[model samples]
Target: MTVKKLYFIPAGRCMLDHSSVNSALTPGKLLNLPVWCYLLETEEGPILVDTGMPESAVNNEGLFNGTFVEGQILPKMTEEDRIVNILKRVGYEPDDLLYIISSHLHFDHAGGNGAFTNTPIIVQRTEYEAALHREEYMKECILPHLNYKIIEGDYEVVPGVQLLYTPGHSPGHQSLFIETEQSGSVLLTIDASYTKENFEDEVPFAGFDPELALSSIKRLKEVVKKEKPIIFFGHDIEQEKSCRVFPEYI
Candidate 1:
């Protein structure tokens, strides 16, 4: 079997702070967060890990305002931020997208799902239910005419790509693990471990359940210890600066 790989597709950038990602961190510190969605090049097909925000998110006044104030977000997006353009630039189109694995249903993670109208969107059942209630943030993002694959826990997306259930940021939040050719085992701690500090201190934002948050952190730490994979932090400013963007595969 051929080993798969990851292509980092940076959707856009946001101006956040320590407090935005981690409630325990410094509230005033400015953090530059990059909204990232990954493209997994596998023999099975090109599977998308997350579908960062679409162009529509920037103009959605109410959602934009609420997000900006709450997390100090700045919609500094470009052509690559748009799903269709991102795929097209990489020699693939929206039609090439077969599977979309959502770590969570947050606007930043699942905003561009519309691009994959016929693709199977794999998400946690609890996360789907939770998204149904978050009408304010998910108004323009979530639609009724999308196909979803609701799983209860850990699920194998492909031969080597697996969805690790690490709920905390949300009731059904999860992380991704991909067996890559260049980087050995790659672990994407999307929101499960927001930043390097969050992983180091085992801190999490008080989003859904704090107790579950701590447990999820512990799970990721244990995975890191056992597998020793190259860990990917979700919204880490420093980490993003050091990461390789598209046209660069890992």
Candidate 2:
């Protein structure tokens, strides 16, 4: 059976500009909002969807902080916010986290992985190796403390959760395919597709995988139509607010 509430842990929060650029118009400033790592409730324990913002982002002014905003385009993170804090506030200890699944190695997505060091963190072998060394797709977000299970390909992690490669944002960027006869299927993507409009409109952008991303969209679209899976955008505030997830009232 499903464990309990599926938590959307907002480790840290930030904002973007007015232009329909930068993830396409993030809309004015907001608190308790930024990169989100979803926690799936399972019989075994809680499986962290993504880690959300790197620790380096906080200490040194990095991309996600106020480091190169004016000069280089990057996200931001607040001082007080943290993944551990969010977990603690929800009454979960560091020891309580079962697994950490990195969708990709971006700083914002895999930031708090150090905190889950003791536990079995799941990351793609390609992604992890890249992050561990000199690679563009893999940011310097992989901490030494993390005890990892270096996964290579698609496999159902739990009874319902299966990881699939939807490499667009990054080479090893993946989307979790969550399936249960009860809830049907849910796709949790990290930067795979940011907006439902992108998924629906099937528009391809440069710097992002036009071919792979669009292919994944068509593939997932078929899944939604044929299999009827619940497709979730990586960072769509509009869909997330309106869509009701398990154990939470929409």
Task: Give the candidate number with the greatest lDDT.
Answer: 1
lDDT of 1 by residue, 28-79 (tens): 7776678898998899898888887766656443335655365455555665
Give the Å shift of residue 117 in candidate 1.
0.7
Pairs of residues at least 3 apart in sequence or in different chains that clash in candidate 1: none
For all candidates, the clash counts are: 0, 5
Point out the worst 10-residue segment of candidate 2 by lDDT.
Answer: 14-23
For 70-94, candidate 2 gives per-residue lDDT tens digits of 4233446555456777677666777
Q: Evaluated with TM-score, which candidate comes out highest?
A: 1
The 10-residue segment of model 1 with minimum total lDDT is 59-68
lDDT (Cα, 0-100) at 152 in candidate 2: 82
Q: After superposition, how far is residue 190 of candidate 2 from its true place, in Å?
A: 2.4
